[PDB]
Design a protein around this motif. Structure first.
Motif, short mmCIF file in Angstrom:
data_model
loop_
_atom_site.label_atom_id
_atom_site.label_comp_id
_atom_site.label_asym_id
_atom_site.label_seq_id
_atom_site.Cartn_x
_atom_site.Cartn_y
_atom_site.Cartn_z
N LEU A 89 0.83 -1.20 0.00
CA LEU A 89 0.00 0.00 0.00
C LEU A 89 0.87 1.25 0.00
O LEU A 89 0.61 2.19 -0.75
CB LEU A 89 -0.94 0.01 1.22
N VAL A 90 1.89 1.25 0.85
CA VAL A 90 2.84 2.36 0.94
C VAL A 90 3.54 2.58 -0.42
O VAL A 90 3.68 3.72 -0.88
CB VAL A 90 3.82 2.10 2.12
N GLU A 91 3.93 1.48 -1.07
CA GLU A 91 4.52 1.53 -2.41
C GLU A 91 3.59 2.16 -3.46
O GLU A 91 4.03 2.95 -4.30
CB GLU A 91 4.92 0.12 -2.86
N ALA A 92 2.32 1.76 -3.42
CA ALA A 92 1.31 2.31 -4.33
C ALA A 92 1.15 3.82 -4.13
O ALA A 92 1.13 4.58 -5.11
CB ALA A 92 -0.03 1.58 -4.16
N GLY A 125 4.26 13.64 -2.47
CA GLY A 125 4.34 12.83 -1.27
C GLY A 125 2.95 12.46 -0.80
O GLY A 125 1.95 12.72 -1.48
N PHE A 126 2.88 11.85 0.38
CA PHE A 126 1.62 11.31 0.89
C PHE A 126 1.66 11.19 2.40
O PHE A 126 2.71 11.39 3.03
CB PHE A 126 1.32 9.94 0.25
N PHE A 127 0.51 10.87 2.97
CA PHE A 127 0.45 10.45 4.36
C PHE A 127 -0.13 9.04 4.46
O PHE A 127 -1.12 8.71 3.80
CB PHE A 127 -0.27 11.47 5.25
N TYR A 128 0.52 8.22 5.27
CA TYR A 128 0.07 6.86 5.53
C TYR A 128 -0.38 6.79 6.99
O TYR A 128 0.44 6.89 7.91
CB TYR A 128 1.17 5.84 5.23
N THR A 129 -1.69 6.67 7.18
CA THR A 129 -2.28 6.69 8.51
C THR A 129 -3.14 5.43 8.72
O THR A 129 -4.37 5.49 8.61
CB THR A 129 -3.12 7.98 8.74
N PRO A 130 -2.48 4.28 9.01
CA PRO A 130 -3.17 2.98 9.08
C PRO A 130 -4.19 2.87 10.21
O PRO A 130 -5.14 2.09 10.11
CB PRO A 130 -2.02 1.98 9.28
N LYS A 131 -3.98 3.63 11.29
CA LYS A 131 -4.96 3.71 12.36
C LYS A 131 -5.69 5.05 12.30
O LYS A 131 -6.69 5.25 12.99
CB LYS A 131 -4.30 3.48 13.73
N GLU A 166 10.16 2.96 2.61
CA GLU A 166 10.26 1.67 3.29
C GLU A 166 10.78 1.77 4.72
O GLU A 166 10.27 1.11 5.63
CB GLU A 166 11.16 0.73 2.48
N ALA A 167 11.83 2.58 4.90
CA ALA A 167 12.41 2.81 6.23
C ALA A 167 11.38 3.45 7.17
O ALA A 167 11.23 3.01 8.32
CB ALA A 167 13.67 3.67 6.13
N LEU A 168 10.66 4.46 6.67
CA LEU A 168 9.58 5.08 7.44
C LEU A 168 8.49 4.06 7.81
O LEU A 168 8.05 4.02 8.97
CB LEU A 168 8.95 6.25 6.66
N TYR A 169 8.07 3.25 6.85
CA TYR A 169 7.12 2.17 7.10
C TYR A 169 7.56 1.26 8.24
O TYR A 169 6.78 0.99 9.17
CB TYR A 169 6.89 1.35 5.82
N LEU A 170 8.81 0.80 8.18
CA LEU A 170 9.37 -0.13 9.16
C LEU A 170 9.58 0.49 10.56
O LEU A 170 9.31 -0.15 11.58
CB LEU A 170 10.68 -0.72 8.63
N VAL A 171 10.06 1.72 10.60
CA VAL A 171 10.31 2.42 11.86
C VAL A 171 9.01 2.81 12.54
O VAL A 171 8.84 2.58 13.74
CB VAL A 171 11.22 3.68 11.65
N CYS A 172 8.08 3.37 11.77
CA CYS A 172 6.90 4.02 12.33
C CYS A 172 5.79 3.05 12.73
O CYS A 172 4.99 3.35 13.62
CB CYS A 172 6.38 5.11 11.39
N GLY A 173 5.75 1.88 12.08
CA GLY A 173 4.77 0.84 12.40
C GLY A 173 3.33 1.31 12.32
O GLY A 173 2.95 2.01 11.37
N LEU A 209 -6.75 6.41 -3.36
CA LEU A 209 -5.32 6.65 -3.10
C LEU A 209 -4.92 8.12 -3.21
O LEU A 209 -4.17 8.61 -2.37
CB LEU A 209 -4.43 5.82 -4.04
N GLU A 210 -5.42 8.81 -4.23
CA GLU A 210 -5.08 10.22 -4.45
C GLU A 210 -5.54 11.13 -3.30
O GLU A 210 -4.98 12.20 -3.10
CB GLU A 210 -5.61 10.73 -5.79
N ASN A 211 -6.54 10.68 -2.55
CA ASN A 211 -6.98 11.41 -1.36
C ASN A 211 -5.92 11.47 -0.26
O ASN A 211 -6.02 12.30 0.66
CB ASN A 211 -8.31 10.85 -0.84
N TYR A 212 -4.91 10.61 -0.35
CA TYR A 212 -3.83 10.58 0.64
C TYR A 212 -2.52 11.24 0.18
O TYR A 212 -1.56 11.29 0.95
CB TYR A 212 -3.59 9.16 1.16
N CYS A 213 -2.48 11.76 -1.04
CA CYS A 213 -1.34 12.56 -1.50
C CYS A 213 -1.41 13.93 -0.84
O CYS A 213 -2.50 14.41 -0.55
CB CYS A 213 -1.35 12.73 -3.01
#
Lengths: 29, 21, 29, 21
Positions: A11-14, A23-29, C13-20, B16-20
């Protein structure tokens, strides 16, 4: 590559690939 | 959130684009 | 894995792994 | 930012953790 189940690093890769220089934000919770 | 929408169900470019930034 | 030059997918990837479960923000610009 | 600190120079755990939510 985006129209599937995407989890974890997949997902992070996508997000990385779609969002580019924005860039983006990844907020799984 | 993103996990519910893109991991536990099928993702989309629209979603997905909503998270850029 | 963190104490090196990390660029592009490697950095994400590093951010993914560190941040969990916290997740992260990737803001290259 | 992160690119300057972690790509164009050597990254650190201290720096990376600043980008976790």
């Amino acid at each position: 590559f985006v129209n599937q189940h995407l989890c974890g690093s997949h997902l992070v890769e996508a997000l990385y690939l779609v969002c580019g220089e924005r860039g983006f934000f990844y907020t799984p919770k | 959130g993103i996990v519910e929408q893109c991991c536990t169900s099928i993702c989309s470019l629209y979603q997905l684009e909503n998270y850029c930034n």
